Amino acid sequence: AHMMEKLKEIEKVTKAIKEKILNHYGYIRVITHHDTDGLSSGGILAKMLMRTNKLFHLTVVEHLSKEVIEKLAKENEVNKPLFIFAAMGSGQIEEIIKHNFNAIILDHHPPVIKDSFINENIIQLNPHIFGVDGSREITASGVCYLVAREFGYYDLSVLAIVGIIGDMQYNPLLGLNKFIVNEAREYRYVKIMNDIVYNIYDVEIYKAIAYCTKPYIPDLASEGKAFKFLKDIGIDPNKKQLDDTDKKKLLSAIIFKYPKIENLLIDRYLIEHKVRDAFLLSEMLNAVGRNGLFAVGIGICLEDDECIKIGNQILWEYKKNLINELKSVKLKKLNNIYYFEGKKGMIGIIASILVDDKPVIGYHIEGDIAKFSARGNRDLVNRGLNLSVAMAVAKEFGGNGGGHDVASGAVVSKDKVQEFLKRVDEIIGEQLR
Template structure:
C-alpha cells in the first residue's frame, strides 16, 4: 500500500492535499500548458508522461527540453509570461525545486514535479504548487525519480500504463540496484495492471537487441577496460565457444560467460541485473533507458520523446544514435586523462558526456567531469554508494559554485555546477577541501 511509503499520516495527508491541488489546476486550465523538462533519461520519460497525460486530457501543450534550468532559461520564460499573463500554465519536470526563487520572481503560474532537494520546503509558494519527494521524507536520490513523481500525477487520472516510463526513468537515474520505496510501489502497480510482463534476473548483455559481441562492446554498465574493443571481445567469446551473432544467451552460455567475466568484475551484481520486460515496442526497460539517454546526450531529445511514445521512425533513429554515442564514450574513456587532488579526481571532457564518464570512473574518490560553455565551465560530479555512506553529499558540495558567481546542486551521489572560467582552480581547491571534511565526519 502507498500509505506505507510515507513516514507518518501527516506526510500522507500533505501528499494527498497537494496532488488534489495539482490535478485540479491541470483539469481546470483552459490555455496553453508549457512543459519544461531535462534532457536525460529521467527528464525525457518525465516529459513523455506529462504530455501523454495532457494529450489524453485534451489539453493544448508545448514541450521544451533543456540541459539546465539556468537563469537565462527562466528569464526567457518570464518574458513569455509577460506577453501572455495568466494564459500559460508552466509544468517543470525533473527541475524547478532548486530554482523556485527565480520562478517566483517572474510570477509564473507553475507546477513543479521534482525529486531534487528543494530550495523552499513547502507545497505551495505564492501560487506555485510543488510536488517534491523530499517534502514527504522520501529520498529523491534512491526511492523515486522525477518520472516517478510525474507518474503519481498521471495515475490520479487512471493512466497506469505510464508506470513503465517511470520505471525506465528510475533506471536511467541509477535507482534500480535495487528498487525501493516509492519506486517499488510503482513497479508493483505496473505488475498489477500487467504493464510489466516479467522480471528476469539475467546477464546484463541480454538487455540489448544486438548481437552478443556488440552488446558487450557498447555496454558501459559495467565498463571492462580489458574488453574495450571488438577484437578483444570476439577473441574472448570464441575461446568460450559462444556464437558471436546471437542476440541473447541461453542458460549454458550465460553461465559460461558469467564465470569467465568474474575475473574482470568485483561482484555478481556488476554483470547480473533484474530485467524488466515492459509493454512497449522496446520491451526491456534497461535498453529503453539507454536509448533515451543516448538521444538526450546527443542533442536529439525530441527523438527520445518519440521513442518513449513508441514512434517507429524515432526508435530506428535512436538505435543508430545509441551505437554512435557508445562508440564516442568508449573512445573518450580510452583518452580521458585523470587529474588527482587530495580528495577528488577530475578531467576535462566533451559536453553531454562528462556525467557518464565521471560515473564510470568513480572508485575511492568522487570524480568531476568538466567542459567549457562560453564564459563558464560546467561540472558533473559523481560519487558512489560507498562514498555516500561515508558522508559524501555532492549536492552540498556543488553549491560552492555560488560563492564564485555560479550555481549548482543535485543529489548526494550525483550533482552539477556551473562556474565562471576564471574561478575554476579556486573552485576545485575549495571542493577538494569540503569533500575531505565530509568524508572525515
C-alpha cells in the same frame, strides 16, 4: 507504517493538480529537462494531457536560468497559459512567484519553499514536502506518474520505470519507486527478471560486451577482443541472448578480468512498450537527449516507429563514440584517487564510468578556471568516503566545492590544480583509514 498512508497525504495535492488541469481551457506550456528523466516526464505529461483533451506546447531547457524564466514571462502577457514544470521549478520558485505564473511544479529536487500550495495560482508537488528523499526514493517521472494515476492512466508507469533507471535509482529500489514498480507489476505493465546486463541490448553479444559502459571492462572493449573472449569460452558471439549455461560460463571466465561480477547482474524490467527493455529505452533516451534530439525523444516515448529507428541508430553511434572517448583518457594515479583531464561535458560521465576501486576526478580547464567532477561508489562510501567534504577543500585554494558523498564538483584557478589534487588525495586517504 504504510506507503498507503503517505500516498493519502500526497493524493490531496494530486487531486488539486487534476482539478486544476481539467478546468483549464487556455494554452498549456510544458517545460522539462533533456535527460532521460525529463524526456520520460515529457512523454507522461504528453500522453496524459492528450487523454484529457488538452493541446499543449512542450519546450526543453537544459537550465532554468533567470533569463529563461523572463523569456517565458513574456508569454504571459498575451494569453496567460498554465505552465507545468517537470524536474525543475522548485529551486527557481522565487522567480516564478515574482512573475505570477499560473503554474504547476513537479520537481524532486530539494525545495526552496516547502509548501504544496504556494498561493492561489501555483501548486508544487515535491516529495521532500512529504518526507521522501528525491535523490533515492522517487524521480521526476515518478512525480508526473503520481499525477497521471489520478486519471487512472496506470499504463504510464512504464515511463516512470524508465526515469527510475535514467536517474540511477533502481539499485536499491526504495520508497515510492518501489511502490510504482510494484503497481506496474500488479497491472501487468512490467515483468521483472534477474538477468545479465548484456542481454538487454538485443544485439550480437560481442557487440553488447564491446560497447558496455555499466560496467566498462577495458580488456573487452572492442568487437575483436569481445569476439575472441566469447569464442574461447564456447559461446556463439553472434547470439543475441545468453541462456543460463552461457551466463555461467561467461561469469566464470570474466571474474578474472573484472572481479566485481555482482555488477553484471540486474533485475531486468520488460515493459509494455515497443522498446520492451526499460534499460535499453533509458539508454536510448539518454543518447537522443545528448544529441539535441528532444522532439525525437518525445516521439520515442509516444512509440512512433521512425523516432525509435532514429533513436536506435543514435544510441549505437553514441555508444561507439563513448568507448573511443574512454580509450583516449590519460588516467594518472595518485595515492588514493585517479585523475584525468577531459572535455567540458564528458568529465562527469567518464569519471563515473571509470570508477572501480578508487574515486576518480576528471577536470577541464576553461579560461583560468579548472572545474572538477569527482565520483565514487557505494562500496567506497561504506569504507568512509565522502566527496562533498573533500571537494570542499577547494576554498583553501581560493575556490569552493561540494556535492554528495558519492558525487561532487569543485572549481580552482588553473595553476593550483596539482596542489588541489594532492590535498584531495590526502583527505580521501584519511576518510579511508
